[PDB]
């Protein structure tokens, strides 16, 4: 089991960490959701599906920078929504193919407070998402740590 980002940055067998630079909607109005859809950015595959079923959870989702201070969030994991920052670990998603498949994570972030300025600064760390990969074969328990950075400013008009 291994993963890569849309631009080809890889985390090999055994886990590790990688940075993900995501485009954000430049404007998020009060009462609207800022969607950070990682399913277009993070992809994983099973290296021996003939015998092994890979299990993948969101082990931890943490907020940083502007998202931590001024946004309220949920994370959608494989069609179900959970609080963001995370309190529990999600149900497992299954990977059983050598062809890359999306990691189905998206953040839904709604502004709490804003003065009209830049709520999220371009280049800042907005989230750390830890993917935990286990299987039905051995006791492997590997962490794939995704450091989510904003590519652009996000403004919340007021
Ligand atoms: N014949 C044969 C044969 C073989 F060629 C293989 F490569 C393996 C095999 C390949 C990948 C393996 O592990 C990695 O890929 C797993 C599935 O993605 C993942 O769950 C693990 O954590 C880790 O990332 C493990 Cl353990 C074994 C195997 F079991 C075999 F029996």
């Amino acid at each position: 089991f291994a993963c890569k980002t849309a631009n080809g940055t890889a985390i090999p067998i055994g886990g590790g960490s990688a940075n993900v630079y995501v485009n954000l909607a430049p404007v998020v109005n009060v009462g609207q959701n800022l969607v950070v859809d990682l399913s277009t950015q993070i992809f994983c595959h099973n290296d021996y599906p003939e015998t092994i079923t890979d299990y993948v959870t969101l082990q931890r989702g943490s907020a940083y920078g502007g998202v931590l201070s001024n946004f309220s969030g949920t994370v959608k994991y494989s069609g179900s929504s959970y609080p963001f920052p995370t309190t529990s670990e999600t149900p497992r998603v299954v990977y059983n193919s050598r062809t890359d498949k999306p990691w189905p994570v998206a953040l839904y972030l709604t502004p709490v407070s804003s003065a009209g300025g830049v709520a999220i600064k371009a280049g800042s760390l907005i989230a750390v998402l830890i993917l935990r990969q286990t299987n039905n074969y051995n006791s492997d328990d590997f962490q794939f740590v995704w450091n989510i950075y904003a590519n652009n400013d996000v403004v919340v008009p007021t």
Side-chain angles (χ1 to χ4, degrees):
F1 178 91
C3 303
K4 63 183 212 172
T5 68
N7 75 338
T9 304
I11 301 177
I13 288 162
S17 69
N19 301 323
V20 185
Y21 300 93
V22 306
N23 299 342
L24 302 172
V27 178
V28 190
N29 287 113
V30 178
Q32 295 308 305
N33 297 316
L34 176 59
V35 182
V36 189
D37 188 358
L38 289 315
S39 71
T40 58
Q41 306 296 129
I42 298 164
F43 308 92
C44 303
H45 71 269
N46 183 326
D47 283 307
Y48 201 71
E50 296 79 359
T51 289
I52 304 176
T53 301
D54 284 324
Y55 304 124
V56 172
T57 67
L58 175 65
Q59 180 188 354
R60 190 191 189 94
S62 304
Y64 294 93
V67 170
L68 177 59
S69 58
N70 300 133
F71 283 84
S72 186
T74 67
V75 54
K76 181 167 270 170
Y77 193 70
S78 194
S80 293
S81 289
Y82 308 92
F84 178 80
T86 59
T87 56
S88 64
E89 169 178 16
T90 63
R92 293 161 294 166
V93 305
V94 171
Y95 292 85
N96 58 7
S97 184
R98 289 196 179 79
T99 64
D100 286 320
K101 302 289 175 66
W103 191 37
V105 184
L107 308 175
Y108 290 79
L109 309 171
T110 179
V112 179
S113 177
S114 165
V118 177
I120 296 168
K121 293 176 84 175
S124 64
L125 182 71
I126 58 161
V128 177
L129 307 177
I130 304 175
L131 180 170
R132 185 213 302 276
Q133 173 251 322
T134 58
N135 61 41
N136 71 338
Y137 180 73
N138 59 20
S139 63
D140 287 353
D141 193 327
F142 295 136
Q143 295 185 297
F144 295 69
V145 179
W146 305 102
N147 299 309
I148 315 308
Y149 292 85
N151 267 340
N152 56 274
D153 285 354
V154 179
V155 168
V156 177
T158 62

